[PDB]
Design an enzyme around this catalytic site. Structure first.
Site, PDB file in Angstrom:
ATOM      1  N   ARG A 132      27.901  -5.647  -0.545  1.00 25.32           N
ATOM      2  CA  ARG A 132      28.862  -5.027   0.352  1.00 25.32           C
ATOM      3  C   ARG A 132      29.779  -4.035  -0.332  1.00 25.32           C
ATOM      4  O   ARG A 132      30.652  -3.470   0.328  1.00 25.32           O
ATOM      5  CB  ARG A 132      29.703  -6.098   1.046  1.00 25.32           C
ATOM      6  CG  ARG A 132      28.898  -7.023   1.945  1.00 25.32           C
ATOM      7  CD  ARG A 132      27.829  -6.295   2.763  1.00 25.32           C
ATOM      8  NE  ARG A 132      27.203  -7.175   3.746  1.00 25.32           N
ATOM      9  CZ  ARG A 132      25.956  -7.039   4.190  1.00 25.32           C
ATOM     10  NH1 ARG A 132      25.192  -6.056   3.735  1.00 25.32           N
ATOM     11  NH2 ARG A 132      25.471  -7.888   5.085  1.00 25.32           N
TER      12      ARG A 132
HETATM   13  N1  LIG Z   1      33.031 -11.520   9.223  1.00 26.17           N
HETATM   14  C1  LIG Z   1      31.990 -11.187   8.428  1.00 26.17           C
HETATM   15  N2  LIG Z   1      31.041 -10.312   8.830  1.00 26.17           N
HETATM   16  C2  LIG Z   1      29.999  -9.981   8.049  1.00 26.17           C
HETATM   17  N3  LIG Z   1      29.809 -10.488   6.820  1.00 26.17           N
HETATM   18  C3  LIG Z   1      30.679 -11.378   6.297  1.00 26.17           C
HETATM   19  C4  LIG Z   1      31.841 -11.786   7.092  1.00 26.17           C
HETATM   20  N4  LIG Z   1      32.529 -12.664   6.352  1.00 26.17           N
HETATM   21  C5  LIG Z   1      31.867 -12.802   5.179  1.00 26.17           C
HETATM   22  N5  LIG Z   1      30.769 -12.037   5.150  1.00 26.17           N
HETATM   23  C6  LIG Z   1      29.809 -11.939   4.034  1.00 26.17           C
HETATM   24  O1  LIG Z   1      30.039 -12.952   3.062  1.00 26.17           O
HETATM   25  C7  LIG Z   1      29.710 -12.426   1.781  1.00 26.17           C
HETATM   26  C8  LIG Z   1      30.596 -13.054   0.731  1.00 26.17           C
HETATM   27  O2  LIG Z   1      31.938 -12.810   1.116  1.00 26.17           O
HETATM   28  P1  LIG Z   1      33.070 -12.999   0.007  1.00 26.17           P
HETATM   29  O3  LIG Z   1      34.268 -13.634   0.652  1.00 26.17           O
HETATM   30  O4  LIG Z   1      33.229 -11.715  -0.762  1.00 26.17           O
HETATM   31  O5  LIG Z   1      32.343 -14.070  -0.935  1.00 26.17           O
HETATM   32  P2  LIG Z   1      33.184 -15.261  -1.575  1.00 26.17           P
HETATM   33  O6  LIG Z   1      33.400 -16.153  -0.387  1.00 26.17           O
HETATM   34  O7  LIG Z   1      32.278 -15.843  -2.622  1.00 26.17           O
HETATM   35  O8  LIG Z   1      34.400 -14.558  -2.116  1.00 26.17           O
HETATM   36  C9  LIG Z   1      29.975 -10.940   1.846  1.00 26.17           C
HETATM   37  O9  LIG Z   1      28.916 -10.243   1.195  1.00 26.17           O
HETATM   38  C10 LIG Z   1      30.007 -10.621   3.323  1.00 26.17           C
HETATM   39  O10 LIG Z   1      28.907  -9.783   3.660  1.00 26.17           O
END
Ligand SMILES: Nc1ncnc2c1ncn2[C@@H]1O[C@H](COP(=O)(O)OP(=O)(O)O)[C@@H](O)[C@H]1O
Ligand SMILES: Nc1ncnc2c1ncn2[C@@H]1O[C@H](COP(=O)(O)OP(=O)(O)OP(=O)(O)O)[C@@H](O)[C@H]1O
Ligand SMILES: [Mg+2]
Ligand SMILES: [Mg+2]
Lengths: 210, 277, 365, 281, 177, 105, 52, 52, 52, 70
Positions: free
Chosen positions: A77
């Protein structure tokens, strides 16, 4: 402190500021997985450090789809809305068609029910899966990639059943004017001045599939 | 806590062998009916090349018969013709006709009562207990014949192969009230057929349409039986694949739990020993 | 009292206490940090009090993305306008050695506690991944001449985590609404650091991996997240009864999943098909497109009011919208947008064609 | 189904979020209603000790006890998680000493050890820091003697020593229905009963989520209200015949139209055992 | 008179309007047959096609040049370009002849048809060949049938059918070649 | 197996030949090294194995390569302990194996 | 490059990399020792290299 | 579960081809001629590729 | 699990054994009916994966 | 019999017993695969039920009687 090991190793791959030289560094850590579990120790450690994933499934590799990118679990992302936009026009539609193909292939693990419009999805996805896979040690530049995904996210390739797309991709790469490749590389995106040429050239193709 | 995933593997593996047995049962029984269905297909063509095919007729009273299975391991069969029952009963109603919905099979009353209960009168069960016989068809036909509708509709799945089950409407009309009326094209296309009956045509067509109903209902509750064996075959090889993939996932989880338990209880010993000496 | 968050599954199933603690339990890739950015983008603007974002051992690139977001969104104003800013970042991200990640939560907590005690206003402490504090203490504790405890952790885990987490609570003079991500180690909720962390959170919102594998974002497990505000003395009886109804239907579906996997939906009775259909509709309906997830999806984010949550979920529980398919409830704002997407969903099933002529793609224009 | 007599150690064990504390608080809340009706001699004086709980939770319970009037009879020993592990090791014992005064002088006592699975952690911290060798999972082997020294103090004495009593209520937090955990397997063997609460019954509507196949009381029907013994003697049988007829009908296979009644009869009983949050009947 | 324009091909368009569009149209028995009635021809000389049927078996579908049906006004023979016929048959023998070979089958009562294309559709319930019937218990079966004579019209009809069936079996077992 | 590697290395480097080697049941070489590394007092690693599993197996398997003099091709029978390929002995074995040959009953 | 051991199945389907490592998933009585002896005999006969 | 004569002509030619290929993967081995009598046959690679 | 089926006492009928179960010690008519009850209970246990 | 193996094999088996045990364990190996089908006794295949009843012949043949050495 294995988490600190991988963290202080990978955290140095940055895109530096414009006052610090403007350089960059891109990591590609490769984690060996046993029986495909994401819930290991090292896998779930390095996932919480890395900015994305590229999941290579064993079952997709065994069926001859090489590279075996599991497009469901593979997310990155930071690079989306940071990439080559001429790809990004058709690539979102490509993502939707691959997601629809994942959903309808899960819904039909065996072929018994025919709806005659979901079969358009099951044809398009097995077409695009054959378009995206490639042979080894073969880099493809972005201008010869935008055209090959442009000519498959749209029509221009449904004439073959599924098979000779391995000839049809190199066929459409050969039979287009290589002048449009310079335009699509230098411009960055598919202008309407080049979109009408891209619709124009793609219908005179001597496709080996019939 | 490691005893749950081993006994769950024990359960799913024997469920897998159960469905690996019942796929053999159903694909075997599909073949012993296959020496009879094409034989029971013998009497379904002369009546339709004689009476024609006139389903969309404005009957005043009609007995639609949706024949289903007995044991509920169907797999896209019973609810299919349950929705086909209302889908072919709704296009036929335009002026408020009397409708007597009849279901054959124990899995008919369990599903057709939900959608159409006020027009539901007869539920014939245990019809595939031994096999299908023609006198059973004559008896259920007579139990329909106690009432005097203007038409019949027979909803049943045509067994064409082990993959395709297209449901069919077999049509049986009332002899003097609607059958001879629908043949009126520039006179009557039936009168070229010279009658060789004892009495007049009006009571030999009664005998003919009762025989037509009995034959086509026999054919319906044989073709539904053979497509039931075929659909149980197609459903027991999905339960076998499902209890194969579930067993694979539970075996992977058993291996991961085995490694985690042996590593934790080894760490227990090393932490007990190095903190002693 | 209630804290309105503008997320559907959050405001329905585990509503947040305005003077409590908020936990996010995530398993590396389920989106607890994206969920906490949407919780920032909803709460920290409307909640006019000061906010403290203490990043404890998460990605540095996310810290820089938050800094470039909070500069150009007016949260942090630089130059001559430093006084108008509403956030203070304390950053001990994962490149710092495990001495420094073992105390940066305490630094962010001290900055929050000065705003609580002396200033006396309501503070939003957004601690990012408080498990990394326990990880840094466990990495230190292998060398401190101590014995290893359970799985690999400290002998002094519980009193250390208590000595942090009992500071973040709302006194008579000030309030600290704490939103903490809690990274579960390896999707292992029996691990002693999340097992100790469950006992300290007022409204725990657990994010699962399997629900993320179905694409339902946010991947909140609706049957394991709960609150103390989920009680009919504080939220009114209608909200509590609809919450217990939707949890009842989801628990019955999670019971039926085994027989659905082995046999399929064909073997089940018609009332159980009704339960499964309602359960799939309310299972997709907890999903929404976020306002922070629009940077990688193109879908515009939707804020959902609490009355619209209670309207839509009460309607799909009783059966006012049983005619709509499953996909009409996927990635939607609320029950107006469900029927708006059902209009769009129906429309494209026939109109799919007719683009051969009347295009700009002749040569001469 | 699991009736509780005076002099019985009855265990309240569940998952993380089941009705564990709330089914204990109802036993304290109802002792306001009984003690305003029973005479002076048979009065029950509750003591709720909190081990390792949040300090905001203890300030909610003393908000609740002063709201209903239960604080007139209740001691509230709080060992919060701010307290060091030598305090939370001690507070179930010292709560028992404050409750054993009522067992000393002929009255009846009630003690509820909240989350003894956090007393064992606060005993695990000192024993791993005084350099005692760890045994199971990190716990020293005498963690059974940690609880058995404590839970066996709850007793109903004889009539020459005053005739008092002391009813315990240890509370145990499992992880995922893991009744094979080391700390829980000690307390299930110690206590006379077991009230096992399951979370997948808690979201199915059963509140309190008493897993009624797994809840037993060794004191049994000798120590219950006499009116409920003759009546509910078939109740635990009628729920017993509910489970195996619901363990067969889940596939959607077949009904028998009389075992459909015995599944319907248990369903009028399963919805009968639900109760509200703070309601004493 | 014929104010209902029904039909299988018209049923597709009246099925497309009320049922939802996701389902294929159900099939009809007109789609599972190709040998029709008014399809002119189907004679091609002296061999006319014979569709001899039975509910549980198919004993003959090959082409014959003579079929003799035991009609209720008497036995009558069917030729190539036979008259269009709806004939209720007596319990008796049908005579299958392809030429020099002749095979005779005893039928139990059931209809028989000739359509204008010269094809026949013989439709009887139990078509017992004369090699599997006995000449021994038929006289005992008639002796049972010529004994029980009660007053019920139902029993009178069944017993008269028994007499006629057993006497036809006797006449079609005594005069065999 | 190091003696086997020494006689194979003499047949490769000095005699210039194309040598085969047969490590009989490499899991027992793993087990013998696990026994000598639990014997000396080193802390045992995952499921029961030595902490020096990867390097003291790679000390064996990396003398088995091609050389400009000759080659050594080794045919090692591999036994999977619980018939589990997530076990660290076949997981550390199979990162060196080039071609597997399943024998069937 | 490839090692021609002489058997059709292990030279055709799963070829033996010359200089690489080989895995045998044998058992009992499946002729693994006969396979070993034939491999030794073929390599020593053709490729001029010994075995250990 | 269906029968030996059930499958089509497009597949049963491959059934015959696999049933003559799988027996063709065998080989007489020269080290086993001391108790099998038949002498072994060392096969080259190009002959294997062409003859398969 | 027998106690949850309500059989009081919850004696496991299969795995309860004795050295006093030899027919030359207790007579054969006891050991025959005991092994019969064990066999019948074992058939019911093998069947209750299909009855379930 | 499906797990218990002798790594020596039939090479040191008593001859005469070697003439019969190879067929015995072959029918038993077919039996253990056609095992857990005896509960569907009403459904035959007329050859799988023959090897099923022959496996039931042989499995109840090899029973011993508690210090009865033969
Ligand atoms: N509301 C959402 N819509 C689309 N994708 C989401 C959403 N929430 C989380 N994601 C996906 O979850 C993945 C991990 O999110 P992130 O919070 O960065 O990881 P972590 O929880 O390990 O920090 C991201 O690549 C994102 O694409
Ligand atoms: N009888 C009941 N009826 C309805 N809701 C209940 C009932 N008992 C408890 N609850 C609800 O269930 C939730 C959990 O109850 P409880 O306080 O017992 O949890 P807990 O297991 O004690 O949590 P912890 O052990 O972490 O303190 C509370 O929000 C409470 O409102
Ligand atoms: Mg993050
Ligand atoms: Mg509690």
């Amino acid at each position: 402190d294995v988490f600190y090991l991988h963290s202080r190793l990978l955290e140095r791959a940055a895109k530096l500021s414009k006052e610090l030289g403007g350089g960059s560094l891109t990591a590609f850590p490769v984690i060996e997985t046993q029986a495909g579990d994401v819930s290991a120790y090292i896998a779930t450690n390095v996932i919480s450090i890395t900015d994305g994933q590229i999941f290579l499934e064993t079952e997709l590799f065994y069926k001859g789809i090489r590279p075996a990118l599991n497009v469901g679990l593979s997310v990155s992302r930071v690079g989306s809305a940071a990439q080559f936009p001429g790809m990004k026009q058709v690539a979102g539609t490509l993502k939707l068609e691959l997601a629809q193909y994942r959903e309808v292939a899960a819904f039909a693990q065996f072929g018994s029910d025919l709806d005659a419009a979901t079969q358009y999805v099951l044809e398009r996805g097995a077409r695009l899966t054959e378009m995206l896979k490639q042979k080894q040690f073969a880099p493809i530049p972005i201008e010869r990639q935008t055209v090959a995904v442009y000519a498959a996210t749209k029509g221009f390739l449904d004439k073959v059943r599924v098979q000779d797309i391995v000839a049809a991709e190199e066929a459409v790469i050969s039979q287009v004017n290589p002048a449009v490749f310079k335009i699509l590389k230098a411009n960055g995106k598919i202008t309407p001045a080049l979109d009408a040429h891209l619709k124009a050239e793609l219908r005179k193709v001597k496709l080996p599939g019939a | 806590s490691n005893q749950a995933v081993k006994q769950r593997i024990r359960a799913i593996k024997n469920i897998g062998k159960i469905t690996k047995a019942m796929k053999m049962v159903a694909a075997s029984k599909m073949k012993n009916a296959q020496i009879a269905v094409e034989q029971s297909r013998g009497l379904v063509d002369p009546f339709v090349r004689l009476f024609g095919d006139f389903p969309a007729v404005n009957s005043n009273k009609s007995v639609v018969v949706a024949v289903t299975s007995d044991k509920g391991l169907c797999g896209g069969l019973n609810s299919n013709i349950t929705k086909y029952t209302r889908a072919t009963l709704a296009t036929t109603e335009s002026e408020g006709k009397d409708v007597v919905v009849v279901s054959i099979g124990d899995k008919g009353r369990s599903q057709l009562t939900r959608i159409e209960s006020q027009r539901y009168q007869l539920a014939i069960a245990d019809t595939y207990k031994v096999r299908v016989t023609f006198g059973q068809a004559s008896l259920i036909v007579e139990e329909l014949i106690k009432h005097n509708p203007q038409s019949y509709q027979i909803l049943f799945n045509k067994f064409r192969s082990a993959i395709s089950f297209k449901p069919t409407v077999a049509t049986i009309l009332s002899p003097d009230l609607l059958e001879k009326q629908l043949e009126d094209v520039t006179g009557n296309s039936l009168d070229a057929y010279d009658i060789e009956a004892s009495h007049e045509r009006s009571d030999v067509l009664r005998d003919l349409t009762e025989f037509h109903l009995g034959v086509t209902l026999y054919n319906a509750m044989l073709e539904n039986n053979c497509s039931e064996h075929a659909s149980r075959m197609s459903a027991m090889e999905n339960s076998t694949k499902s209890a194969g993939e579930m067993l694979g996932k539970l075996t992977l989880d058993y291996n991961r739990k085995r490694q985690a338990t042996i590593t934790t209880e080894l760490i227990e010993i090393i932490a007990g020993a190095s903190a002693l000496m | 009292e209630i804290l309105v968050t503008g997320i559907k599954v959050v405001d329905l199933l585990a509503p947040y206490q305005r003077g409590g603690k908020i936990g996010l339990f995530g398993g590396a890739g389920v989106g607890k940090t994206v969920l906490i950015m949407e919780l920032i983008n909803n709460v920290a603007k409307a909640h006019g009090g000061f906010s403290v974002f203490a990043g404890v051992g998460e990605r540095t690139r996310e810290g820089n993305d938050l800094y470039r977001e909070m500069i150009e969104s007016g949260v942090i104003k630089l130059g001559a306008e430093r006084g108008n800013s509403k956030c203070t970042l304390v950053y001990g991200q994962m490149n710092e050695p495990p001495g420094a990640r073992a105390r940066v939560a305490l630094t962010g907590l001290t900055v929050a506690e000065y705003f609580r005690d002396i200033e006396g206003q309501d503070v939003l402490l957004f601690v990012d991944n408080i498990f990394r504090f326990t990880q840094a203490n466990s990495e230190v504790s292998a060398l401190l001449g101590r014995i290893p405890s359970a799985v690999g952790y400290q002998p002094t885990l519980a009193t250390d985590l208590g000595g942090l987490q009992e500071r973040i609570t709302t006194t008579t003079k000030g309030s600290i609404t704490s939103v903490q991500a809690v990274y579960v180690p390896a999707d292992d909720l029996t691990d002693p650091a999340p097992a100790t962390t469950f006992a300290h959170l007022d409204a725990t919102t657990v994010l699962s991996r399997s629900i993320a594998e179905l694409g339902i974002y946010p991947a909140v497990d609706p049957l394991d997240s709960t609150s103390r505000m989920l009680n009919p003395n504080v939220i009114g009886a209608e909200h509590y009864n609809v919450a217990r109804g939707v949890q009842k239907v989801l628990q019955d579906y999670k019971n039926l999943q085994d027989i659905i996997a082995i046999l399929g939906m064909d073997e089940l009775s018609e009332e159980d098909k009704l339960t499964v259909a309602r359960a799939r509709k309310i299972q997709r309906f907890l999903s929404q497109p976020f306002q922070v997830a629009e940077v990688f999806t193109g879908t515009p984010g939707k804020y959902v009011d609490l009355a619209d949550t209670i309207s839509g979920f009460q309607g799909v529980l009783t059966g006012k919208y049983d005619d709509l398919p499953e996909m009409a409830f996927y990635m939607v704002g609320d029950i107006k947008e469900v029927k708006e997407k059902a209009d769009k969903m129906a429309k494209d099933i026939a109109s799919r064609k007719e683009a051969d002529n009347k295009k700009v793609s002749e040569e001469l224009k | 189904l699991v009736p509780i007599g005076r002099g019985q150690r009855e265990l309240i064990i569940g998952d993380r979020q089941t009705g564990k504390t709330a089914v204990a608080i109802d036993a304290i809340i109802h002792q306001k209603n009984c003690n305003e009706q029973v005479p002076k001699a048979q009065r029950v004086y509750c003591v709720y000790v909190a081990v390792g709980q949040k300090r905001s939770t203890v300030a909610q319970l003393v908000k609740l006890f002063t709201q209903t009037g239960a604080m007139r009879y209740t001691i509230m020993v709080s060992a919060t998680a701010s307290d060091a592990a030598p305090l939370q090791f001690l507070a179930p014992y010292s709560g028992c000493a404050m409750a054993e005064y009522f067992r000393d002088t002929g009255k009846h006592g009630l003690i509820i050890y909240d989350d003894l699975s956090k007393q064992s952690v606060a005993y695990r911290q000192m024993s791993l820091l005084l350099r005692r060798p760890p045994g199971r999972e990190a716990f020293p082997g005498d963690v059974f003697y940690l609880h058995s020294r404590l839970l066996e103090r709850a007793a109903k004495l004889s009539k020459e020593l005053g005739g008092g009593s002391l009813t315990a209520f240890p509370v145990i937090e499992t992880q995922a229905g893991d009744v094979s955990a080391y700390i829980a397997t000690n307390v299930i063997s110690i206590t006379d009963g077991q009230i096992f609460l399951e979370t997948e019954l808690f979201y199915k509507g059963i509140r309190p989520a008493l897993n009624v196949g797994l809840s037993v009381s060794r004191v049994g029907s000798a120590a219950q209200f006499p009116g409920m013994k003759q009546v509910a003697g078939t109740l635990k049988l009628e729920l017993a015949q509910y489970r195996e007829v619901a363990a067969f009908a889940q596939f959607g296979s077949d009904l028998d139209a009389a075992t459909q009644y015995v599944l319907e009869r248990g369903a009028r009983l399963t919805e009968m055992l639900k109760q509200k949050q703070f309601a004493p009947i | 008179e014929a104010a209902a324009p029904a039909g299988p091909k018209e049923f597709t368009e009246v099925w497309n309007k009320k049922a939802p569009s996701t389902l294929i149209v159900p099939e009809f028995p007109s789609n599972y047959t190709a040998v029709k009635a008014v399809g002119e021809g189907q004679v091609h000389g002296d061999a006319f096609p014979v569709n001899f049927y039975t509910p549980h078996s198919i004993l003959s579908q090959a082409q014959k040049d003579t079929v003799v049906l035991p009609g209720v006004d008497g036995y009558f023979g069917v030729k190539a370009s036979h008259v269009p016929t709806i004939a209720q048959l007596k319990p008796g023998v049908v005579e299958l002849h392809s030429g020099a070979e002749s095979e005779k089958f005893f039928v139990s009562g059931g209809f028989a048809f000739v359509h204008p294309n010269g094809v026949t559709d013989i439709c009887v319930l139990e078509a017992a060949t004369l090699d599997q019937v006995d000449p021994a218990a038929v006289k005992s079966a008639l002796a049972a049938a010529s004994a029980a004579q009660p007053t019920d019209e139902f029993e009178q009809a069944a017993n008269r059918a028994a007499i006629e069936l057993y006497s036809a079996l006797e006449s079609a077992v005594e005069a065999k070649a």
